[PDB]
């Protein structure tokens, strides 16, 4: 019964005493903390608390959205050589760094992910000549559907999968996705792999990433510029932010302390030095 | 009145006892007993096994050697259980299961000796490989050195094999071999084999995962990491030794999905 | 005007929406609905009715009837699988072209259990006993009907009763699995070996074929809404 | 699946030019590096080349670089192999190899460990 905005226990008035209850002395080898406040070691007063874990409860910890990635897309021009780009990005929370350290504070965790997409716009080429406002398609392609291969292919028609119809110099686009795992719950740690490699059976056959598996597949998100070509190219930039709301977590581990280095938990050669120098003397 | 004690210790599962004198308690993972797979949370249809006794009893590894110059052991769950009589046959025979373990890690030493040794039990313990070419590249066999279990380094050595690459990790001892702090591994269920005090370090351990049963032959679901906080040193000596042993016992042992035997490639 | 404001998404198209909008005809007389029999409610009930299973795909069998039939023999016992299927029930291309499968393809993530239905269709005078199986993942794909004969099976006897229905059960890692050829979400296979060995007398047909069906249990699900990829439009 | 059929086993001579593709028509999680193995008889199978799906992230075998090309049709969907100058050491059955998810082939770059999609086989000879 107790809420997160509710006030934490006020700290009350102790005088002093000299006995056999030994609140100062305990062994951490049993791996407890021991649960002290200030009145077991040092004689306090009567204090009417009023501060709460308001502002640290899971919940708001994750109550903000971040760059997830940068999607790059373009509408060169007809004459072109090279074909018009779109983007295709697998989705994961691992590209960036920021938001994966907090989700990795932990072991597992369950929340309905909040999407937004701002959409930036530019002209490359030095010329004077001009374009007409885009509009922009999120197509979100989830594992096994076909991904598009042009970006005028029949996949882009989508009859079932989910897409987005954004119009620049508008609000940002945001959707919402439930709890999509195939597990119980996320996990960000996986101890183990995907295949079991057997003894009669060639190596090859039996490899699989160390810590990879679908607990993390959910496909992949394209995109487009709906516009057909245009004289003079224009290049765009779609960034996604990722709020994971309603958010539940399990199993708090240590925080990254070395810059990561692939999706894994591996690290790099001279990234292992994260604290500086301090002598054991001084404050 | 009786006497007892927090540090007298005698834990019993199956036809086999552990006994000790110099405990520090005990400590139960996140404060959750093991159980046995609820039908609220069930998920694989056929009736399941539950070996019982058979599965669930003491087991003893093989005896490694602390000295001055270790920087740590780890070993994973199941894993360094997979030839141990019954569950281990249990374990290659079906697809599917889960279960509990109640670790003890033995060393004793003297009151003349001194060192800190941290037992922790991490959940997913992901381990960090070897390559600076490659990532998430540690093999399967590598990776599950079984009861031997493996060791933790001072110092991170890069392979540079590019032709036939040696796949294995490379747990950095203060990076607790994860890239994070030996400092907060406190985090986890832990104890202390600090030999002033204590002999033993006993911690009970549900079943963790992101679902109720998987593979474990495919899946670690715990890992005990065992690294000395202070160092082994005895009165003026400069090398001593003293043993560590550690005897692991699954608990609410079930598995599901029986079919004919996995013969994984080991080496 | 009452004070309003404009949030993030105002503007945008999504598909998925579900929102009202005015009508382009308004007061339209509909014509009201006939009890046409054969209503459907959901997609698993088409899913829950078994189809045939275009088992030998081989070059020569291939889009062409007899892929349909699995031709079987009196030779004496052997312990070779006479066909092994792998449990990739949206994926494998033996099972992606049945109702079932095809349905498959419009979703991510399956769950529940499935049964497979066996036709004899030999001649009376022939008997014969089987073992169809189901192992799970993880280990060896059978080969021999020792193996196979270790996992789930029916053993079925060639009599009045002209077929046979094998269940496999759910038995998942995960709540869900992926429509896709995966190995996390590894199915397990399927298996049918001769028990005995087909006998018929004489002046009867020494070979003869066996037609397969699968389909979902009442309680198989599918979710997360995709496009399938058994169709295209080239230009 | 995704399709893979792969042909093209010419016996050519030491030094000659030989085209090798593979069928990736259909569209699932696409492969991404693609990926080409060759089993020699004489030692086992392994890597070789490939192309990322979308991007250009082709790695290549220390034994190939150069020689050795990948690409491919981002349309009428096969894999093209460029294998030019060929040494007599290059005799084996090649492989195509689908590695799906293209985070297959950019964690671990190179096939191998994300390739669940096996190709046919070709043989090509390279003799005096």
């Known amino acids: 019964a107790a809420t997160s905005r509710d006030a934490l226990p006020n700290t009350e008035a102790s005088g002093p005493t000299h006995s056999k209850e030994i609140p100062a002395l305990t062994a951490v080898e049993t791996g407890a903390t021991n649960p002290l406040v200030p009145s077991d070691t040092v004689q306090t007063r009567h204090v009417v608390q009023h501060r709460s874990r308001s502002e640290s409860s899971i919940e708001s910890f994750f109550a903000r959205g971040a760059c997830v990635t940068i999607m790059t897309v373009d509408n060169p021009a007809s004459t072109t050589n090279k074909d018009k780009l779109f983007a295709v990005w697998k989705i994961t929370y691992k590209d960036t760094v920021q938001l994966r350290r907090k989700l990795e504070f932990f072991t597992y965790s369950r929340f309905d992910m909040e999407l937004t997409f701002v959409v930036t716009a530019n002209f490359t080429e030095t010329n004077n000549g001009h374009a007409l406002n885009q509009v922009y398609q999120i197509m979100y392609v989830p594992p096994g559907a076909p991904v598009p291969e042009k970006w005028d292919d029949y996949t882009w028609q989508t009859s079932s999968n989910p897409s987005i119809f954004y119009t620049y110099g508008t609000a940002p686009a945001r959707i919402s996705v439930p709890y999509v795992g195939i597990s119980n719950a996320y996990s960000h740690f996986y101890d183990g792999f995907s295949k079991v490699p057997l003894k009669d059976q060639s190596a090859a056959l039996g490899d699989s990433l160390y810590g990879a598996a679908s607990l993390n597949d959910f496909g992949i998100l394209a995109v487009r510029v709906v516009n057909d070509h245009n004289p003079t190219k224009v290049t765009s930039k779609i960034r996604v932010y990722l709020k994971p709301k309603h958010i539940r977590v399990w199993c708090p581990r240590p925080p990254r302390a070395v810059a990561y280095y692939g999706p894994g938990v591996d690290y790099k050669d001279g990234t292992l030095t994260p604290l500086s120098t301090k002598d054991l003397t001084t404050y | 009145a009786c006497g007892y004690s927090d540090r007298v210790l005698q834990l019993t599962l199956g036809n086999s006892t552990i006994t000790t004198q110099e405990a520090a308690n005990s400590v139960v993972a996140y404060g959750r007993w093991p159980e046995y797979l609820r039908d609220s949370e069930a998920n694989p249809v056929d009736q399941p096994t539950e070996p019982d006794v058979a599965a669930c009893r003491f087991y003893t590894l093989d005896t490694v050697s602390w000295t001055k110059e270790s920087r740590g052991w780890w070993w994973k769950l199941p894993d360094a259980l997979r030839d141990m009589g019954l569950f281990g046959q249990n374990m290659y025979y079906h697809y599917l299961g889960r279960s509990g373990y109640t670790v003890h890690v033995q060393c004793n030493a003297s009151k003349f000796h001194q060192g800190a040794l941290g037992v922790f039990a991490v959940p997913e313990m992901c381990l960090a490989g070897d390559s600076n070419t490659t990532t998430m590249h540690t093999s399967y066999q590598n990776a599950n050195p079984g009861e031997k279990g493996g060791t933790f380094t001072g110092t991170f050595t890069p392979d540079n094999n590019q032709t036939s690459p040696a796949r294995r990790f490379c747990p950095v001892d203060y990076l607790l071999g994860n890239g994070t702090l030996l400092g907060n591994a406190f985090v986890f269920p832990h104890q202390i084999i600090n030999l002033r005090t204590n002999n033993c370090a006993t911690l009970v351990l549900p079943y963790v995962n992101s679902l109720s049963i998987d593979s474990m032959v495919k899946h670690n679901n715990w890992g005990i990491a065992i690294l000395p906080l202070a160092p082994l040193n005895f009165a003026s000596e400069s090398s001593p030794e003293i043993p560590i042993t550690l005897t692991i016992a699954p608990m609410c042992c079930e598995f599901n999905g029986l079919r004919n035997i996995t013969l994984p490639r080991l080496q | 005007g009452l004070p309003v404001m404009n949030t993030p998404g105002s503007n945008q198209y999504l598909t998925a929406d579900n929102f009202q909008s005015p009508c382009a005809l308004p007061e339209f007389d509909v014509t009201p609905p006939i009890d046409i029999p054969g209503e459907v409610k959901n997609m698993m009930e088409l899913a829950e009715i078994d189809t045939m299973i275009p088992f030998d795909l081989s070059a020569t069998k291939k889009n062409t009837m007899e892929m349909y039939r699995v031709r079987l023999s009196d030779k004496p016992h052997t312990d070779d699988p006479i066909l092994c299927l792998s449990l990739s029930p949206a994926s494998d291309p033996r099972l992606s072209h049945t109702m079932l499968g095809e349905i498959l393809n419009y979703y991510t993530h399956w769950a529940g259990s499935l049964k497979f239905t066996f036709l004899f269709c030999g001649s009376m005078m022939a008997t014969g006993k089987l073992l169809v199986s189901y192992a799970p993942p993880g280990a060896d794909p059978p080969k021999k009907r020792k193996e196979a004969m270790l996992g789930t099976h029916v053993i079925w006897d060639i009599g009045l009763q002209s077929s046979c229905t094998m269940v496999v059960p759910w038995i998942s890692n995960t709540t869900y699995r992926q429509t896709i050829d995966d190995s996390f979400t590894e199915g397990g296979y399927i298996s049918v070996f001769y028990q005995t060995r087909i006998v018929v007398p004489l002046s009867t047909p020494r070979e003869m074929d066996i037609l397969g069906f699968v389909s979902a249990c009442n309680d198989f699900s599918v979710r997360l809404l995709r496009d399938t990829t058994h169709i295209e439009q080239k230009a | 699946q995704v399709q893979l059929q792969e042909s093209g086993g010419g016996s050519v001579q030491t030094g000659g030019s030989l085209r090798l593709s593979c069928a990736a028509s259909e569209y699932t999680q696409s492969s991404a590096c693609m990926g080409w193995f060759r089993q020699a008889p004489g030692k086992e199978r392994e890597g070789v080349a490939g192309?990322?799906?979308?991007?250009?992230?082709?790695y290549y075998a220390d034994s190939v670089k150069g020689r050795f090309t990948i690409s491919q049709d981002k349309a009428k969907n096969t894999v093209y192999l460029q294998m030019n100058s060929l040494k007599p050491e290059d005799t084996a059955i090649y492989y195509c190899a689908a590695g799906q998810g293209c985070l297959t082939t950019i964690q671990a770059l190179g096939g191998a460990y994300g390739y669940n999609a096996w190709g046919q086989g070709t043989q090509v000879t390279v003799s005096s």
């Open positions: 192309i990322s799906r979308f991007f250009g992230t082709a």
